[PDB]
Paper text:
As the thin crystals of dCNPcat could not be grown to dimensions suitable for neutron diffraction, the structure was solved using X-ray crystallography and refined to an atomic resolution of 1.04 Å. The proposed catalytic mechanism for CNPase involves two histidine residues in the active site; His309 deprotonates and activates the nucleophilic water molecule, and His230 coordinates the leaving group and protonates it upon completion of the reaction. The chain of 4 water molecules at the bottom of the active site is coupled to another group of 4 water molecules above them – representing a true apo active site, without any bound buffer components. Anisotropic B factor refinement and alternative conformations reveal directional disorder in the vicinity of the catalytic cavity, for example concerning a number of aromatic residues.
2′,3′-cyclic nucleotide 3′-phosphodiesterase (CNPase) comprises 4% of total myelin protein in the central nervous system (CNS), being the most abundant CNS non-compact myelin protein4. The CNPase catalytic site, lying in a groove between two lobes, has pseudo two-fold symmetry and contains two apposing His-X-Thr-X (X denotes a hydrophobic residue) motifs, characteristic for 2H phosphoesterases 113537.
Author numbering: 162 to 378
Write the structure that this text describes.
């Protein structure tokens, strides 16, 4: 029997991966120095940290090696639920190796993860899986809302958490967030969502080039 990839997704080109990685790092630096973030630090960490400055680049140390990616379907070589159905789809086979542009609308941080929110085109949405275990933070969010690029994770967090963290952030702002920004960073408006959750809504969306394919460990 033929096994499947570990996961399907869009793998950023080297240059797009470097552009987004650098924007993520700049965000972490700017956020950690922002007055609003600093005065909410005890909502973010929970230990015996001193009354000194947290460097978010250190905090989010488990950064992807190599290129960045946006996962569609985690397959675990066929062991994940829904893997075989996903992979057999015409659209997946037709798209395999195709180039796409991914639109990044926002960067976000929680105490667990840092990531970029991806807003998929209608063509890209056809590659989004139709799975069976709906996260409660996805209630009243449209399919494909979880799409993201992981930028870093805290030490004991697994990268999958980044999509759950995005969904939870999106739940906070689903009714609209006009007038609610706590402040601004150079590239957009900064939102403080409580419980260590922060979102930079980009003034101008970023656009990265990627290729749809399957990754094998
Ligand atoms: Cl979703």
């Amino acid at each position: 029997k033929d096994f499947l990839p570990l996961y399907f997704g869009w793998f950023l080109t080297k240059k797009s991966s470097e552009t987004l990685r650098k924007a993520g790092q700049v965000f972490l630096e700017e956020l950690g120095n922002h007055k609003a973030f600093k005065k909410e630090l005890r909502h973010f960490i929970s230990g015996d940290e001193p009354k000194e400055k947290l460097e978010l680049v250190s905090y989010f140390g488990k950064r992807p090696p190599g290129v960045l990616h946006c996962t569609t379907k985690f397959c675990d070589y066929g062991k994940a639920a829904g893997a075989e159905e996903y992979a057999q789809q015409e659209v997946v086979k037709r798209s395999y190796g195709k180039a796409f542009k991914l639109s990044i609308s926002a960067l976000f941080v929680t105490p667990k993860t840092a990531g970029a929110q991806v807003v998929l085109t209608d063509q890209e949405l056809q590659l989004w899986p139709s799975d069976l275990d709906k996260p409660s933070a996805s209630e009243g969010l449209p399919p494909g809302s979880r799409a993201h690029v992981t930028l870093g994770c805290a030490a004991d967090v697994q990268p999958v958490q980044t999509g759950l963290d995005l969904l939870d952030i999106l739940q906070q702002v689903k009714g609209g967030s006009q007038g609610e920004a706590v402040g601004e960073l150079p590239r957009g408006k900064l939102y403080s969502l409580g419980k260590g959750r922060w979102m930079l809504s980009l003034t101008k969306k970023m656009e990265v080039k990627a290729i749809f394919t399957g990754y094998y460990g």
